[PDB]
């Protein structure tokens, strides 16, 4: 199915310091492949997957200089915004930037995006085509007018449709063994009596890739939703993911309940029951 | 691969 290349950037001002902390990560789907951290000794984009180590020093020199440009750009933005909002130097403020590609199962361009935040609220962002901007407030409205004169959006659009996609298409081929793998969930169920006439059924999905997964409980076929505790899908640490869903039921009615597991990896959906 | 001509505010 679909695949995406998403880069994330975070700069946080340190008033008790000179320089902002700056962190950049690059994902392909749910798999991180690069990082930069201002506080890491390196001062270079470091690989974080085996299929990116493959690239020559030409590549790395470029990624390092462009990430340095992002770092320096966020530096001046922190300053500019502080001024637009008449905020003192004593406060710690944050900017965030997220951009990238989506492609379809036919690896062609589906969608692009580029969004900017100040202190965790939307500042300015590209609309769904990539020709205009949504400005949150009156500060962002001056940023819009300024970017419109300079054809900021056009240059961005050329990257998002186009080169971002071309690079995604490349990473998917070179990393084929990991990125185009699916790994079906391994599953089990646990039954723990809560109180004296009531028990918790918890249904587990472990070791699956990608992270997209549905885990639902049904009672006689009806889908519990108000009554299910569901935890956010979480990284295993070995490039796989984990979720669980729980529900509390009257004891002796456990047979009426079934867990349903939907995942790209599984041919047909699994259905687990409470079986000793 | 990262974008080159990232703009300032």
């Amino acid at each position: 199915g679909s695949h995406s290349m998403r880069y994330f950037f975070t700069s946080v001002s340190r008033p008790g310091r000179g320089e902002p902390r700056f962190i950049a990560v690059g994902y392909v789907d749910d798999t991180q492949f690069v990082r930069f951290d201002s506080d890491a000794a390196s001062q270079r984009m470091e690989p974080r997957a085996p299929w990116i180590e493959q690239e020559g020093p030409e590549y790395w020199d470029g990624e390092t200089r462009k990430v340095k440009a992002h770092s320096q750009t966020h530096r001046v933005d922190l300053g500019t915004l502080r001024g637009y909002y008449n905020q003192s130097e004593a406060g710690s403020h944050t900017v965030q930037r997220m951009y990238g590609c989506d492609v379809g199962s036919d690896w062609r361009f589906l969608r692009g995006y580029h969004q900017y935040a100040y202190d965790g609220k939307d500042y300015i962002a590209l609309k769904e085509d990539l020709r205009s901007w949504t400005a949150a407030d009156m500060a962002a409205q001056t940023t819009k007018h300024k970017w419109e004169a300079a054809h900021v959006a056009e240059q961005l659009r050329a990257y998002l449709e186009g080169t971002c996609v071309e690079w995604l298409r490349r990473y998917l081929e070179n990393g084929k063994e990991t990125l185009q793998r699916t790994d079906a969930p391994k599953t089990h169920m646990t039954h723990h009596a809560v109180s004296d006439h009531e028990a918790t059924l918890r249904c587990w999905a472990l070791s699956f890739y990608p992270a997209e997964i549905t885990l639902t409980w049904q009672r006689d076929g009806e889908d519990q939703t108000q009554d299910t505790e569901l935890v956010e899908t979480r990284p295993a640490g070995d490039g796989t993911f984990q979720k669980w869903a729980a529900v509390v039921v009257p004891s002796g009615q456990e047979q009426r309940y079934t867990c349903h597991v939907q995942h790209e990896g599984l041919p047909k959906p699994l259905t687990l029951r409470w079986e000793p | 691969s990262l974008y080159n001509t990232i703009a300032t505010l």
Partner: T-cell receptor
Framework: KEVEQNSGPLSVPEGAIASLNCTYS??????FFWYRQYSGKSPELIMF????GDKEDGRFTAQLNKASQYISLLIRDSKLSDSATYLC???????????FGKGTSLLVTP | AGVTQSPTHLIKTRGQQVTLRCSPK?????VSWYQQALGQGPQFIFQYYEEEERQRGNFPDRFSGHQFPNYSSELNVNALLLGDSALYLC???????????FGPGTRLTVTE
């Protein structure tokens, strides 16, 4: 060399459409410019193009085609003062440098 | 207000050094240097932003640069060869459009 264009001279009759091409090989190539340089002077940017297709600007039309990897420039209604060398430059996504062609010399004949 | 450069012409003997100046356009802060040999395209030497060599071309150690805190720049070359004879172009840009604009140049002729 990365960006290729013919030296010329192109000879064009005054009034008639001049026509310059430029081909490049790096698929990273993302932004494109035409500069004009008169004898003994600096290059001056006459057009930038960022998106596939045509862009018209008065007498000048630039044509980018990323699949085939060319950029053309057409000068409609050629004047004598259009006699100059036309350089094309590409900027690839890997960095901030402009990469240039030799330049094509254009003589407009009266 | 436009990009400025100096000197406009120079004659240097081989093995000497030279030092070319460039001031960017008002409102621009990045400068790139380029070498233009006669009848040929400008070749990127290097680009300076926030007083640091942001990126370098195919030019060896003996070409060094500097960018001052006003955003102006110096290109120093030493151990001049006859091969260094060229139009040294300086180009300025902002960090919004990134459009590069050239100054007049410095015409260097190196003779033995």
């Amino acid at each position: 060399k990365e960006v290729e264009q013919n030296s010329g001279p192109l000879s064009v009759p005054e009034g008639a459409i001049a026509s310059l091409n430029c081909t490049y090989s790096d698929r990273g190539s993302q932004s494109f410019f035409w500069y004009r340089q008169y004898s003994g002077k600096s290059p001056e940017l006459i057009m930038f193009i960022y998106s596939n297709g045509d862009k018209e600007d008065g007498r000048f039309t630039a044509q980018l085609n990323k699949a085939s990897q060319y950029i053309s420039l057409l000068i409609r209604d050629s004047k004598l003062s259009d006699s100059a060398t036309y350089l094309c430059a590409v900027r690839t996504n890997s960095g901030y440098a402009l990469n240039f062609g030799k330049g094509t010399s254009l003589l407009v004949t009266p | 207000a436009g990009v400025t450069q100096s000197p406009t012409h120079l004659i240097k003997t081989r093995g000497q050094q030279v030092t070319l100046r460039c001031s960017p356009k008002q409102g621009h802060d990045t400068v790139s240097w380029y070498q233009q040999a006669l009848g040929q395209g400008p070749q990127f030497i290097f680009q300076y932003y926030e007083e640091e060599e942001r990126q370098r071309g195919n030019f060896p150690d003996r070409f060094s640069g500097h960018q001052f805190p006003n955003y102006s720049s110096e290109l120093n070359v030493n151990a001049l060869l006859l091969g260094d004879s060229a139009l040294y172009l300086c180009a300025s840009s902002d960090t919004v459009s990134y459009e590069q604009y050239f100054g007049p140049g410095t015409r260097l002729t190196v003779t033995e």
